[PDB]
Amino acid sequence: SGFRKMAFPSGKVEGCMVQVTCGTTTLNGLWLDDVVYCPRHVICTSEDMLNPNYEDLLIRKSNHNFLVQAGNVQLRVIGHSMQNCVLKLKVDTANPKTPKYKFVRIQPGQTFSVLACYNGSPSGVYQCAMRPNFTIKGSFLNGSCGSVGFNIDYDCVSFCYMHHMELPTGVHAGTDLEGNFYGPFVDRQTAQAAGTDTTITVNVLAWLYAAVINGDRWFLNRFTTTLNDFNLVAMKYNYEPLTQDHVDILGPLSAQTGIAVLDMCASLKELLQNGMNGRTILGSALLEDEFTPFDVVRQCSGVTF
Amino acid sequence: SGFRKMAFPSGKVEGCMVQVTCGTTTLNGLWLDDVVYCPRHVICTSEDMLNPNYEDLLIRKSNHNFLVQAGNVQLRVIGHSMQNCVLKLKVDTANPKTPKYKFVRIQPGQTFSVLACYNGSPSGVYQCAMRPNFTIKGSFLNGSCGSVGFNIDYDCVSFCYMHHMELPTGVHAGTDLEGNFYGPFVDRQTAQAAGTDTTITVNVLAWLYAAVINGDRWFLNRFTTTLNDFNLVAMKYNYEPLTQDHVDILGPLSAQTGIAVLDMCASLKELLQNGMNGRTILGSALLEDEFTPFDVVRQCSGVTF
Numbered sequence: 333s334g335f336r337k338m339a340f341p342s343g344k345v346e347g348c349m350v351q352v353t354c355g356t357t358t359l360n361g362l363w364l365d366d367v368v369y370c371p372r373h374v375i376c377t378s379e380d381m382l383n384p385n386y387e388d389l390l391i392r393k394s395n396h397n398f399l400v401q402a403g404n405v406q407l408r409v410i411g412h413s414m415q416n417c418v419l420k421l422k423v424d425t426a427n428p429k430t431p432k433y434k435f436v437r438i439q440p441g442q443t444f445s446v447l448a449c450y451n452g453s454p455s456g457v458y459q460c461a462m463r464p465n466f467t468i469k470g471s472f473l474n475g476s477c478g479s480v481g482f483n484i485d486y487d488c489v490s491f492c493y494m495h496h497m498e499l500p501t502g503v504h505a506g507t508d509l510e511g512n513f514y515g516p517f518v519d520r521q522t523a524q525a526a527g528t529d530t531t532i533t534v535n536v537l538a539w540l541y542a543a544v545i546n547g548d549r550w551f552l553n554r555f556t557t558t559l560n561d562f563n564l565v566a567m568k569y570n571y572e573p574l575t576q577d578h579v580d581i582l583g584p585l586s587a588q589t590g591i592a593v594l595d596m597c598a599s600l601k602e603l604l605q606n607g608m609n610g611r612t613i614l615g616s617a618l619l620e621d622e623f624t625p626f627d628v629v630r631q632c633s634g635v636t637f
Numbered sequence: 638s639g640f641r642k643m644a645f646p647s648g649k650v651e652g653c654m655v656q657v658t659c660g661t662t663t664l665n666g667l668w669l670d671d672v673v674y675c676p677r678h679v680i681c682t683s684e685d686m687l688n689p690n691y692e693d694l695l696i697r698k699s700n701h702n703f704l705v706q707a708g709n710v711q712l713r714v715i716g717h718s719m720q721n722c723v724l725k726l727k728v729d730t731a732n733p734k735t736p737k738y739k740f741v742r743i744q745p746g747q748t749f750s751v752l753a754c755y756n757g758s759p760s761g762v763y764q765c766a767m768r769p770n771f772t773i774k775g776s777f778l779n780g781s782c783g784s785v786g787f788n789i790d791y792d793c794v795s796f797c798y799m800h801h802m803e804l805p806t807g808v809h810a811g812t813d814l815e816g817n818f819y820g821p822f823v824d825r826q827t828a829q830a831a832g833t834d835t836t837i838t839v840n841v842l843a844w845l846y847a848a849v850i851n852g853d854r855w856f857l858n859r860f861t862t863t864l865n866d867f868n869l870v871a872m873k874y875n876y877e878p879l880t881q882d883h884v885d886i887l888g889p890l891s892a893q894t895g896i897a898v899l900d901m902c903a904s905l906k907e908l909l910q911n912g913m914n915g916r917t918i919l920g921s922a923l924l925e926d927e928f929t930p931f932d933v934v935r936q937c938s939g940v941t942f
C-alpha cells in the first residue's frame with residue numbers, strides 16, 4: 333500500500349542524453365541511432381532569441397560548428413537539417429545504448445516523466461501532466477532545454493516531449509520529437525499567452541479510486557448522479573467535462589473496487605460543493621489531477637518494465 | 638523556475654536489480670560485483686514469517702536452492718551467508734554494470750530515492766524521507782522487497798535502504814545494506830509499534846526558501862525571533878527542535894536569498910500559529926518537510942551527475 337507521485341525508471345533515456353554546443357550556447361540533445369535531436373535555438377545568441385530567423389541562422393552553420401559530446405567523447409557531425417522547432421544532427425556513430433523507441437504526440441490530461449538534464453548529464457526524474465492548456469508544471473533552469481518527457485511500455489520508450497521554454501508562473505512549454513509545439517506557442521522571446529488551465533476530471537476520479545484502494549474512504553457518500561448533472565456542477569469549478577470515453581477508461585478501477593463511476597462522481601460533486609473541511613485524501617489537502625487511470629492501476633498492481 | 642519532488646536518475650541502480658527465488662518466495666536482489674544482496678525472508682514460507690528462525694531456515698538451504706536471474710540470465714550461486722537481516726549470495730559472475738558505490742546508513746530527516754521493483758524489474762522512481770520515527774512513506778506491494786533507496790553524488794551511488802515490510806497506515810520499514818533495520822523493528826509478522834512521527838523542521842524551512850527563490854513570498858513577515866522562542870512554539874505543533882547545526886546547514890540558502898534563518902523562523906512561527914488561510918505555497922496547501930536543504934540547492938542550481 334501507499335501512493336506516491338511515481339516516475340518511470342530513467343535508465344533507457346540516460347543512455348541517450350548528450351551535450352550540444354553551437355557557438356556560445358549549450359543545451360541537451362537526444363541521441364538515437366545515428367541522429368541527435370535538440371532544440372533549434374542552440375544556433376542562437378541571446379540577441380537572436382528576441383526575434384530569430386532560424387532558417388537564416390542555420391544556413392550559416394556547418395557540420396563542424398555543432399560540438400556534440402557523449403560524456404567525454406565527441407561525436408563527429410556529418411549532417412544536419414531542421415524539422416519544425418528541432419534540429420536533426422546526423423553523427424558518424426550510432427548510439428549503442430539506443431532503446432526500442434517511438435515518437436508519440438500525447439493528448440492533454442495524459443502523463444509522462446521528465447528527465448531534467450544539464451550539459452548532457454541527468455539531474456533528476458519527475459512525473460508531469462500535459463495540462464489542458466498545453467503546458468506542463470515542471471522544474472527547469474537555464475541549460476535544461478533538450479531534456480525530454482517520456483513513457484515506458486515494457487521495453488519501448490515512447491518519447492513525447494522536448495523542453496524549449498518557460499512561461500509566467502513557472503509554466504513550461506515544449507514540442508514533440510517532430511518539432512511541433514504543444515499549444516499555441518513559438519520559440520521566440522516575445523509576449524505570448526497560455527490559455528486558461530482547467531482540472532483534469534478523469535484524473536481526479538482515478539486518484540479518488542487510488543484513495544479507496546488504500547483505505548481512505550471518508551468521502552464516499554450514499555448517492556449517485558447522472559453524467560449530465562455532474563458535468564453541470566463540475567463546470568462551475570473549472571473542471572473539464574467528463575465523457576463516456578472517460579467513464580469507459582475508469583472501468584478497470586470501478587470494477588476492482590465495485591464503485592460505479594457515476595457513484596464516485598456523486599461523491600466528487602459533494603467534495604467540490606462542500607469542500608474537504610480540513611481533511612486530507614492520500615495525504616493531500618487538495619484534489620490531485622496528475623494521475624491518469626493507467627498510472628493508478630500501474631502503481632497499485634505493480635506493472636514493471 | 639518551478640519546484641517539484643524530484644528523484645535521482647535511476648539508471649545506475651537499474652543495472653543492479655535482479656530476481657531472487659528460493660522455494661516459492663520471490664523478491665528482488667541487488668547485484669554488486671560478485672555478490673547479490675536481498676532480504677532474508679526469501680527463505681521463508683508464509684507460515685514461517687509469523688515467527689521465523691532465519692538461522693535454522695538458512696542452514697537447510699544449499700547454494701543451488703537460490704535461483705538468481707539477471708533478466709533472462711541465471712547467475713550460478715557459489716556461496717551464501719547471512720548478515721543481520723540481509724542475505725549475501727555470492728555468484729560466479731561479477732556484474733559488469735556495477736557503479737561506483739558505497740553502503741551508507743542515513744540519518745532521520747535525510748532524503749533518498751526509491752527504485753520500486755518487482756521480479757527484478759523496475760516499476761518506478763520516487764523520492765522519500767527517513768522520518769524521525771525511522772519509517773518511510775513509500776509505495777510498496779507484495780514482491781517489492783529488495784528494492785533499494787539511494788542517493789547519487791557525481792558518479793557514486795550511496796545505497797542507504799533496502800525494503801522489508803509495511804506497517805499500519807501505508808508505512809514502510811527496512812534496513813541499511815548491512816542488514817540493520819532503521820528503527821525498533823524486526824522482520825517477523827507480529828504486532829510492532831512505530832514511534833510518534835514529527836515534522837522535519839529544517840526541511841520545512843528549506844522548502845520555504847525554495848518558495849522565495851521561486852517568487853512565492855506572501856508568508857514573509859517583518860519580524861525576527863530567537864532560536865529558543867521559535868523552538869518553544871514549534872514544540873506545540875509536533876515539530877522537531879531546530880539546532881544550530883540546522884541553522885548552519887541552511888546558510889547557503891539564507892545567503893542566496895538574503896533572509897536570515899531566524900527571520901524565516903519568525904515567518905514559519907506565524908504560519909504555524911495562524912494557519913495558511915486557504916493559500917498555498919509552491920502549489921501546496923500544507924507545509925512540506927521532505928526536501929532537505931541540499932535537495933533545494935541541487936534542484937535550484939541544476940547539480941548533475
Ligand SMILES: CC(C)(C)NC(=O)N[C@H](C(=O)N1C[C@H]2[C@@H]([C@H]1C(=O)N[C@H](C=O)C[C@@H]1CCNC1=O)C2(C)C)C(C)(C)C
Pocket residue numbers: 359373381472473474475476477496497498499500504518519520521522523524525638
Ligand atoms: C515571453 C514568453 C512567455 C515567451 N517567455 C519567454 O520569453 N521565456 C524565456 C525562455 O524560456 N526562452 C527564451 C528563448 C528560449 C527560451 C529558453 O531560454 N529556454 C531555456 C532552455 O535552455 C529553458 C528556460 C530557462 C529558464 N527556465 C526554462 O525553462 C527561447 C528561444 C524562447 C525566458 C525569459 C524564460 C528565458
Ligand SMILES: CC(C)(C)NC(=O)N[C@H](C(=O)N1C[C@H]2[C@@H]([C@H]1C(=O)N[C@H](C=O)C[C@@H]1CCNC1=O)C2(C)C)C(C)(C)C
Pocket residue numbers: 333664678686777778779780781782801802803804805809823824825826827828829830
Ligand atoms: C504487524 C507488522 C506491523 C509487523 N506488520 C506486518 O506484519 N506487515 C507484513 C509485512 O510487511 N511482512 C510480513 C513478512 C515480511 C513482510 C512482507 O511481506 N514484505 C513485503 C516484501 O516482499 C513487502 C510488503 C507487502 C505489502 N507491502 C509491503 O511493503 C515479514 C518477514 C515481516 C504484512 C502484513 C504487510 C504482509
